[PDB]
Design a protein around this ligand. Structure first.
Ligand SMILES: NC(=O)c1ccc[n+]([C@@H]2O[C@H](COP(=O)([O-])OP(=O)(O)OC[C@H]3O[C@@H](n4cnc5c(N)ncnc54)[C@H](O)[C@@H]3O)[C@@H](O)[C@H]2O)c1
Ligand SMILES: NC(=O)c1ccc[n+]([C@@H]2O[C@H](COP(=O)([O-])OP(=O)(O)OC[C@H]3O[C@@H](n4cnc5c(N)ncnc54)[C@H](O)[C@@H]3O)[C@@H](O)[C@H]2O)c1
Ligand SMILES: [Fe+3]
Ligand SMILES: [Fe+3]
Lengths: 384, 384
């Protein structure tokens, strides 16, 4: 049988964060710790929520120390602020980095033996649910609000590790494009192709089944239809992206991903490469590698990305799907090569071993070898 | 903004009830009350679960007093059995009648001021979550495992009332076609068209939006593809129906239904008409009434029900969608007219007023008048 874990409650649309004060009152919570980053404070995104909490008389404290690719140090620091805050629940405001930090803090607070953080890797053997989390994404996005995963950087071991735990699922997600509009265009582009990567990898993952296929192919259609417009500042395209990125995540931890996420993680660990950019650059190269092991599915991807697939051979349809992703990447300004974002050719074998061992790689529809992954990093790296 | 309430956890596929004992152990529950009916006990469906609970050392008691269109008496009796059982959680085994009884018992147990049952009608202002519910459907089906609705019969007032409450959502749903295979063919047919009715009414309801549209049109495709095969005894078609009926419900408590459910409820109240049969007979007539208020949506319905819509006008595609439902109803043996199932012509004005006032009718895409509903009952009552 197949398990699906989802948010019990989610609010969607512009103004969805307007539901937060009523949700808090209905659940009887007394005081939030907001887990966020300095950019979202500076840009006034956090205040979109705290102004509503202030108006409703709801108490809050803030931890804004999160950094991209959040580290063991960031988790321990946030946990310290949580323990001293008197908060009884968490509000995660931000992209995957704050949402994942918030999950780690919530889990460790109710499972204090995991305070070393390393011990959470894999199927975390936690006995207690997380401190309740209300999740408010500000990128479009990682869908960290709806997965049971969170990804922490071990700086000493130079690796990103995935923690998988039904105990971390947020109680309520608020998916509000008003919270996302202020992303710089390059951040809309990269988080949007990360969303597309979740949807494509989820569509073709070894564990795929009927329900996740239906969700993923709809997410691909929405994201491919909306991302150019959203990057360009179209308000309705932004609302479409907010929905598409969420639907794209409804399979990440229910069925799995593949070698794109497997190869993106070591770039985050080695260089602090932004997750979205890493996935975007890799995606079409990994799609080419996987193409002949994905049945009819690239014909479906090409069709919903606007390709006229009528009369194409399966290989022509596969080539068209890959080309549609290369074209979208160019069209929203994704750097074309890993050399452009400071990846070092001499690191490729170490990156490839880290990718081969990444849990995401296990879902890949083509069984990857070390040599295959080395060649893929070279293909993605090269100016030629 | 649009709210989605879903099961936090759901297991899908033949053998999904095999997950139940581990879910109970992980949640630390001590003793179940199983809420079911005498038929499911007698035919050994309940033992499929209790044999597994016995093997795992999990305590249970049973209330099997549920009858179709469960009444205030059934709820009060089951509440009494629950209170005396020492159970700390509920397991609902059955179709909508046991699932809805279980929701009422769980809500009242934690919100004892609603012990009159009538007071639960509408948006129940309960302060506390239900006693935890694990939901196991045996029909395909009402999707009562995933909606926030439950429907109780007031025998004294001769009316069915709808209770809508986020607090009643089951913690875990187990969607297992092994639990459904014993439905007689006529029961597969009627519960299957009830599922189709959820999916069609949910697709065209006033509150419809992008996510529920995606779920409902996929549910229509699955159900229209599988129902004839499932009624004929095909095991794989039965598993398809188990998924389709669930997806059909993911939309409905989140966006609403329409006049088919509004007109079906008074038939259940007046005559004890089976819910699925009532919906099936009404569905194509109400679809014809609603057709010109549904934009392009009947072209989508006709297409996924196997109609070649290429080259049809929208009005031709609307007619084709209605005809596809008439054809399905004939093919799975739904009685063609309300007179066939003991509906009295002289009751039509009283039925019509009850339907006009039913909360489901408020979602109908065409604003219904008393006169319109009277005419629709007449159209459905005999051949013209
Ligand atoms: N299942 C999961 O939990 C899951 C899924 C995939 C990714 N991840 C993790 O998510 C992280 C990446 O998250 P991300 O891609 O959302 O980026 P991020 O959270 O790392 O943020 C990237 C940058 O964008 C800024 N930013 C975010 N929202 C903004 C806004 N609205 N306006 C202005 N600036 C804004 C941040 O301040 C930061 O500088 C990685 O660590 C990745 O491994 C986890
Ligand atoms: N909760 C909601 O959102 C919701 C939605 C729709 C319908 N409903 C309600 O659900 C009820 C109808 O439920 P239903 O249509 O599932 O039927 P049901 O639960 O009333 O059962 C009908 C008959 O089928 C039998 N049966 C059920 N499963 C069987 C199996 N596997 N093998 C053999 N016999 C089996 C029952 O014992 C009974 O005799 C109505 O009261 C309706 O109002 C509620
Ligand atoms: Fe990602
Ligand atoms: Fe129904």
């Amino acid at each position: 049988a197949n398990r699906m874990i989802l948010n019990e409650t989610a609010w969607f649309g512009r103004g969805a964060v307007g539901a937060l004060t009523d949700e808090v009152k209905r659940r009887g919570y007394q005081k939030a710790l907001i887990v966020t980053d300095k950019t979202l404070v500076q840009c006034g995104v956090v205040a979109k929520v705290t102004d509503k909490m202030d108006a409703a008389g709801l108490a809050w404290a803030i931890y804004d120390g999160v950094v991209p690719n959040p580290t063991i140090t960031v988790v321990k620091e946030g946990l310290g602020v949580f323990q001293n805050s008197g908060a009884d629940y968490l509000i995660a405001i931000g992209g995957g980095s704050p949402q994942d930090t918030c999950k780690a803090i919530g889990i460790i607070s109710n499972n204090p033996e995991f305070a070393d953080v390393r011990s959470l890797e894999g199927l975390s053997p936690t006995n207690k649910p997380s401190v309740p989390i209300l999740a408010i994404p500000t990128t479009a996005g990682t869908a960290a609000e709806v997965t049971i995963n969170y990804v922490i950087t071990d700086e000493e071991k130079r690796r990103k590790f995935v923690c998988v735990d039904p105990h971390d699922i947020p109680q309520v997600a608020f998916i509000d494009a008003d919270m996302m509009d202020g992303m710089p265009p390059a951040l809309k582009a990269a988080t949007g192709v990360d969303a597309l990567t979740h949807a494509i990898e989820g569509y073709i993952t070894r564990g795929a089944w009927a329900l996740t296929d239906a969700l993923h192919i709809k997410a691909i259609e929405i994201i491919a239809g909306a991302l150019r417009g959203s990057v360009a500042g179209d308000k309705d395209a932004g609302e479409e992206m907010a929905l598409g990125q969420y639907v794209a995540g409804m399979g990440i931890s229910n069925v799995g991903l593949g070698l794109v996420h497997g190869m993106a993680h070591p770039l985050g660990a080695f260089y602090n490469t932004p997750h979205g950019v890493a996935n975007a650059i890799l995606l079409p190269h990994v799609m080419r590698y996987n193409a002949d092991f994905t049945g009819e599915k690239y014909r479906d991807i090409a069709r919903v990305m606007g390709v006229k697939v009528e009369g194409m051979s399966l290989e022509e349809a596969r080539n068209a799907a890959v080309e549609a992703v290369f074209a979208l990447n160019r069209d929203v300004g994704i750097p074309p090569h890993l050399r452009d974002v400071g990846v070092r050719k001499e690191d490729i074998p170490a990156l490839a071993q880290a990718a081969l061992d990444d849990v995401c790689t296990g879902g890949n529809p083509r069984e990857a070898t070390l040599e295959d992954i080395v060649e893929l990093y070279h293909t993605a790296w090269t100016s030629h």
